[PDB]
Amino acid sequence: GIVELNRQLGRGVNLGNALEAPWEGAWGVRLEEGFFELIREAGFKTIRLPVSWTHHAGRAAPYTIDPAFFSRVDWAVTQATRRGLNIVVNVHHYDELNANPQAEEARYLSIWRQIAERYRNQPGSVYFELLNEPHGRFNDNPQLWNDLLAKALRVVRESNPSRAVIVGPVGWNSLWRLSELRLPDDPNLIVTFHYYDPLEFTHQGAEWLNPVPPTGVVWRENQGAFAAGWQNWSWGSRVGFVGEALEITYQEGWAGFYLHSDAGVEGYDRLAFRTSAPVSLQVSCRRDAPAKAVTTSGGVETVVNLSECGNPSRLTDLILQNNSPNARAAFRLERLELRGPGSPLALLTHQQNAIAQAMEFAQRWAEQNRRPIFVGEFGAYEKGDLDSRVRWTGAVRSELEKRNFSWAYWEFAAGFGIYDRTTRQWRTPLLKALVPE
Ligand SMILES: OC[C@H]1O[C@@H](O)[C@H](O)[C@@H](O)[C@@H]1O
């Protein structure tokens, strides 16, 4: 059973900044035989092996992969199997494929044919991952990635008829894109996504972004936040999480509190909200649609049916607009949630329940499509304070294992690593946030 394989994945870690670089050690990490034993001792069961093959394969057909690089990957797989561990071999970075899928398709398929035919006789502890974090042109048209992964799975199944293949959506394997993912009817598929929300914390001070985001961002389970997948598009207003509620200062006429979700939600019929003071508002759940005028009163809930403010089939935009030509004094939005025949959705929450909501969306998609879930990457950069990193990592791990998700932390050493190669010591708070045995 594919579910049994995905459960045998369990807990794992990434050997990052290694083989996914232009060459091994180019990004700081060279693979050593002792890392596998350390990972086996720490309590993990799986090792995800980021490998970028585009640097070690011919540019012209038949696009042969360099045999020495193949020997390196064979050494990695053998060290993983010798220590009772699973190993996920993937196609990681591939800028030529993401920038031009049509032209690079033949080379990608030949690379995957070589990889599959080489490891066709490996036991069930060896997993395949077609493409890590598809982006670029795959974001422009996820059907390109759907067709390409269909072709790649065809190629793989030509020699591996029942090996677990790990497939993910576009948008850098964002779960908020699972809705656009289309898989064939193959029984042995494992859906994957990478969780790095919020990006303001997990990637703070990441020198490879442009803009490199500010540093010193704190993360706590009580730190106020919006619902997962909802961005703040408010215009002309000071919107800020002060305490457990949300302070809103309408700074000009017809300014509005705006929450946008690229993914969207379905199955909700009315929106409920409560403010600290009486405010006049225009409520809009559909942009370019008739908003509804509602007058508030302090400490008093207000529920407006979505049918009377836009009536959207898929709720993507939500606007509480200052129904006034002038500015207004600051107030506190203390509640904001959507309700329907099923469970509600708290749009105001903390980072903890935001992680919870993200995992709930992922689990709903997984159950409706009947696919096991393996979170391939999650972690916080070292530029954040260690306490916040430990709290975030523990929260994500707990909410992943609540949803029966197999996961692979990012990463083992260096940047997001849990092992300090300099001191030869485990970063114990992070390790216990991962494995509290
Ligand atoms: O140098 C560190 C490297 O980290 C990786 O995770 C990024 O994808 C690269 O863009 C970067 O160069």
Q: Where are the alpha helices (DSSP H) in 28-140?
A: 33-42, 67-82, 95-99, 101-118, 137-140
CA 13/CA 295 separation, integer angstroms: 52
Experimental method: X-ray
Task: State the residue range of the domain holding 290.
Answer: 231-346
Name 349's Cβ contacts closer than 8 Å, sequence gap at least 6. Answer: 224, 225, 226, 227, 357
Centroid of ligand 1 to alpha carbon of 207 (angstroms): 9
Report yes or no: 213 and 200 within 8 Å, Cβ to Cβ: yes
How many CB atoms neighbour CB 225 within 10 A? 21
Q: How far is CA 295 from CA 247, 273, 280, 323, in A?
A: 18, 12, 4, 9
- Same domain for 320 and 381, yes or no, is no
| 226 within a domain of the structure (yes/no) | no
Centroid of ligand 1 to alpha carbon of 208 (angstroms): 6
Centroid of ligand 1 to alpha carbon of 20 (angstroms): 9
- Same domain for 356 and 342, yes or no, is no
Tokens of 318: 């939500």
- Same domain for 274 and 332, yes or no, is yes
Q: Which of 20, 24, 27 to mutate to test the pocket of ligand 1 (most atoms within 8 A of CB)?
A: 27
Count the domains in the chain. Answer: 2
Centroid of ligand 1 to alpha carbon of 206 (angstroms): 9
CA 34/CA 281 separation, integer angstroms: 62
DSSP letter at 201 equals H
| 249 within a domain of the structure (yes/no) | yes
Residue 249, strand partner residues? 238
* Closest-CA residue to 58 (of 118, 107, 4, 23): 107
CA 437/CA 435 separation, integer angstroms: 6
* Closest-CA residue to 4 (of 359, 367, 404): 404
- CATH code for position 92: 3.20.20.80
Q: How far is CA 219 from CA 187, 214, 351, 409, 414, in A?
A: 39, 14, 8, 18, 21
- CATH code for position 249: 2.60.120.430
- Name which residue sits closest to atom 7 of ligand 1, judged by CA: 208
DSSP letter at 103 equals H
DSSP letter at 177 equals G
* Reported structure resolution in angstroms: 3.0
- Same domain for 200 and 237, yes or no, is no
Pocket of ligand 1 (CB under 6 A): 27, 208
Rounded to 5°, the CA angle 70-74-76 comes to: 120
* Closest-CA residue to 171 (of 181, 161, 163): 181
- Same domain for 327 and 358, yes or no, is no
Give the domain-ending residue among 346, 377, 400: 346
| 325 within a domain of the structure (yes/no) | yes
CA 130/CA 133 separation, integer angstroms: 10
Report yes or no: 105 and 67 within 8 Å, Cβ to Cβ: no
| 305 within a domain of the structure (yes/no) | yes
Report yes or no: 282 and 291 within 8 Å, Cβ to Cβ: yes
- Name which residue sits closest to atom 1 of ligand 1, judged by CA: 27
